[model samples]
Target chain A: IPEIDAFLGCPTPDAWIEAALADQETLLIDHKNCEFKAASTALSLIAKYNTHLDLINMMSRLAREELVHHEQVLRLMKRRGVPLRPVSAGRYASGLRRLVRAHEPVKLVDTLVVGAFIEARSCERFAALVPHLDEELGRFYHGLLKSEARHYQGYLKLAHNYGDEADIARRVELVRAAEMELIQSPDQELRFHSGIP
Target chain B: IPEIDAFLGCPTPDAWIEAALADQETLLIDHKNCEFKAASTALSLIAKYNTHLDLINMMSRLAREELVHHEQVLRLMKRRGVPLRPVSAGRYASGLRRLVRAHEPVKLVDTLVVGAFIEARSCERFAALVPHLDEELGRFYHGLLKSEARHYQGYLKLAHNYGDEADIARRVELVRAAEMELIQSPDQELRFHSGIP
Candidate 1:
């Protein structure tokens, strides 16, 4: 409804949008979980990797920022009296995660690339969903876009700085290809970033 | 202050209390940091030790709950037009941390005991600060007590269940004494839990 064009993947489908608008509580809770998991995942990587000094600092800051965003979302939910619920482990993230390689720099590289797509895609969806949401949330999402876009870049920057440009390029190509499939294909259920009907 | 006693250390001093009341923004921001660090610390515990099934499960849940509080405090700050600030990394945590011993399970136990003291002090301060703050924050802190208290208990329980209850209690006593000294000793700055004036 926001006249958003297709995203890094396709735009979130109308069916999914309607579903989100209808069951906003779930959407908000899932968004909160996404933010928490984003921060936690970043923290986990920081512990395991021999990341460059700056990269470690960047991720630590990013993790903190994401948790801040997570809190912001929770504020919106509480103000609306939407009770917190257990987050569903939806198909979206796992779709890309299943493809992650289990090795050294490749593991970190793949993880970074995967994070890049998630942030990029979530930014796209936030902007797309704004107009479909009520005035409060529309305004909220609008305020969110800049920071959300920044998060995407942070992930991409980390991935690019991880290794050679060609290595990073290869990883991104494979990751983004699956990311596209995860976003464009139909799904039986809907989420904030769910695919078509 | 409000007839408050028996915290992780001691009640926050009157000087600090009034200062915090005047600088609600600083208090809220610091409080937010406290919650995030609490969650992060719990997660670190989970990774380091061969902890119990129930302790792991409880720590996992406690971590989530603290993050939720982290988000709640962030909302309060945002609503009041208080911009988030970098944490001061004040002497509180590091002070108790310097006392931790590096042994087999003892290292983990010391960390858990430190966490317990931190949470205990946090909960006690929440109650202590209530009477000084405005209605909104008073209500907010009041609402936070049970959950905060539960978190403190969770940390203590994990430490106790780790091995010897006597060992865990001894560590808790020593760490809490150091925590009290840290709270009572000023570092030239007044904070939500600054030293005695």
Candidate 2:
């Protein structure tokens, strides 16, 4: 929680929470599917690039944890009788992927930075949700805040390790700005990442 | 239905489906988290590399869809009253990622191919689940079969578009072998992707 508390800041946004709750169904689905994509990509990167035993071990652990979380969500859906019908995805991620460098270490690093932003955003949203949601949801969001914060840190650390520190920092800043833009922009659809609309 | 029928020709191991459903929770959770990772990384790639209008449009649309899926899973969890606790991920993906080349086009192509395999596997699993789950889950799995089938095709198409056909084939074969190995191996834990335990 300290990690989440430290980076995401306090004074959570009421408006954002309202928006997220309003679009809870969409946001939940997005989060569920996105987790699979992220974990698969991360594992793919690690398998193809990092030969280091330690890094592989770390990522392997991360991947396992991610899947477990996915299952937990699915079970919740079933229990609640939330039909697992396919919902349309929003345009936030694909918009960003189109810009990835079609190259090597830079591509990897950039992807990692993007991962950081996602985790950071998730952390931010969880914090925002904690105080605003009903008690059960509040606890759930709070529980997730730590893992998400750590995930962002993990991504940032990996990005730094794999690329030029200054360049990565600059890129992080750039994406962070973009991420903020996505968050702050007016969005017709309500979602965790949807802008201020 | 078209997609599901198309996939009928693709041989799927009954053993793998049995394994995946045995640890349905883990698989569902893993799938959810993995999607998040992919969407984030894809966006990062977009932000850093391709800035073409069409590319941006495509990726943005994909991201939105991915996020929407995420939200759907979360709602499922919330309705079920399943506590969103962090669980460990499996080593299946990391095992595959260990082989990614350090360079550009190769990396991109390989990553895309990997995406294809992941999606294909998900599609195959959904197909398998249709007969085993309750009516609602069976129907839900059937519903997802279409999108997942499309997603696999998209990744395979991208791999072919970006890389040498022969090279892509070779990598696909290699990854498919690896994927099969992962699927067939005995796993202590049950998950969507876990091989027979």
Candidate 3:
């Protein structure tokens, strides 16, 4: 297993860490809410589209894991004295979904690629959290790193499995470029997907 | 909390469940390998860049969780007789990395957005897997649904927070369009992120 030292070895910004610590409760609550949304969304997709037996099976397994994580996070929140409240859906995913093609396989593929970006970003963010969070939360986040990474791989593989090799590469490039842009910008909110907030 | 019923009502796919059961060992092995890669990569990003404290804190939390999940998956694999092995890196990320801007803030934001896509894809894929896996794995995947969803949200939020509003929106659109194209194409591989392979 790769150590935290191997992945992230930088001095965290004192300001940001302080801010995160101050709002730990809200952050945990918001994080829990977000996970809830994702689980529901995944189920909706499988019920609507997915035909392959293998793919469907994998998704089922994933959904279970996601929900379990949600519970764990929620437990963490409760332990931290964070209350759960309904948070509005941020503009991030809806914005991307709006751009999805209105076709069949294309829609599926685009959604999948978008999924890949989400997973990769989560893995990245999780890594980012390691150095700045409390030891308990930090350890928890570190533990999740590998699964999130595999989850990303699974999504990318599924996306590739559904496309032509050359075309997939082109598409990967296209999406990666878009994803990079989203990350680099600033935002007004402090939600998970918000940039520049 | 959303019950499993409200969380995308769908039946499990027999074939996928079988596949997951049959390849439980391979899946666990892959999961471990993927986590190791993710942890390493995440740390590298922090170590190389002067990341913000808030970002670092958040990412650190994420990293810890991911690593824990990696351990959990590995345990599952071992219990199921899955032997760990070295796996090669996929082209999906490296391909995306090539597109990362070499500039300063832009580079950071872009990488974050890419991270968002990765998280989103994982969310989507997990949803997709829910209906196909066996009871235990199915439930497990379902459990992860929420966290993966939130993870995607976190990435997008960070991306927006990092960039200029107008510019970020334009860039998000550009990437979303690109992501759509990649998802809609064809491919020869069956790995995660593969398009129509």
Candidate 4:
């Protein structure tokens, strides 16, 4: 957890947490969507990188775990009678994705670095949200925090595997800056990954 | 299996089997992608259909199983030294998705029907391909046939749950015709879901 905090440029702002708790329904819906999106992205990586056994293996596991989280969130939503409808995505993911270089090992490494940042940010937010949520939700967040940290670590390791240490760190910093901006800047939406609202 | 045969308009053509066998690398790569795509679609449904506990439950399990299949195929590909790169999707899925109505229950029902048809077609092809493939690949396809049949049945049942039997039947027929067209017509690409070559 300390490493995740160290890894992130800034902790989730208190304002974002306040905004998240203010509209719990949107928060949960977007959270559910986020898990699905996470799984989808991992599956794409698994499908795209054929010869990279480690990448494929890591992504396959990540995709399954994310889907399991998606299922868990669905159960929580169902319990509270929350309907799952489409919500427009916040700018956070696109902001990070736009930073990926348009080349091979670089592109792959950047993508993995972006994944690491997202997971780190997600872990940070889950920890931030735990104290404010209800016992059930708080406990769920607590459970997620552990796996999210592991996922973040996995992505970082995979990124290291794909590129040189210096290059990987540079890309990580590049994504970290964009991710921090996306997290700290004012945003119109109250998504799970949205900036201060 | 008989039910799947009855549900589908036609079995995979022999020419497609010949084409598939001729390009086992593409076949395995595309097959791996298909499993990922299948899991991705199920995750999307699980995320989108929040209140439908049964839908979410079925999709959750389906997504997990599909990923397991995805992992299995990856192992096979690695054994065969087939690399995983981006493969263009065939006409099969979009052809099915385009049939989904723009309205609620109908849209949901139509989507489920489409899913059922895909599973059925996939199952049919797996059965067809098993005889021609090498022992290892043949054994794998033989294993997939069972779960694929269950997935087909689950989709049909979900469609029935979402709409009237007559309406579901009519929509099923509508999708059936389109799916048949996608499978029976000539296709330039050789994918896991491609039609006759």
| Segments of candidate 3 deviating more than 4 angstroms | A1-22, B1-197
Which wins on lDDT, candidate 3 or candidate 4? Answer: 4
TM-score of 4: 0.86
Candidate 1 lDDT over B1-197, as tens digits, reads 11115545566777777777776787787787677677777656544431243544565566667767766776687689876556475678888889889786788788877777777777788888888778998999999888767767767777777758778768867987888888877656655556754
Ranking according to TM-score, highest score first: 4, 1, 2, 3
Point to the candidate with the largest lDDT: 4
Candidate 4 chain A, poorest ten consecutive residues by summed lDDT:
A43-52
Per-residue CA lDDT of model 3 for B102-121, tens digit only, reads: 89787777787666665565
Alpha carbon deviation, residue B28, candidate 2 (Å): 28
Q: Which candidate number has the best TM-score? A: 4
Q: Which is the winner by lDDT between candidate 2 and candidate 4?
A: 4
> True-contact fraction for model 2?
0.00
Clashing pairs in 4: A50-B84
Please give, for residues B65-120, the per-residue lDDT of candidate 4 as tens digits: 99899899888887888776667887889988999999998999999989998899
Local accuracy of candidate 3 as per-residue lDDT tens digits, A81-124: 66555455556667656655688777777777777667776677
Clashes of 4: 1
Q: For candidate 2, what is the DockQ-based docking class?
A: incorrect
Interface RMSD of 3: 13.0
Cα deviation in Å at residue B5, candidate 4?
A: 1.8
DockQ of every model listed? 0.05, 0.03, 0.02, 0.47
Supply candidate 2's per-residue lDDT for B168: 79
Model 4 ranges off by over 4 Å: A47-53, A83-86, B14-23, B44-57, B85-88, B95-105, B131-135, B181-190
**Model 2 residue A13 lDDT score:** 51
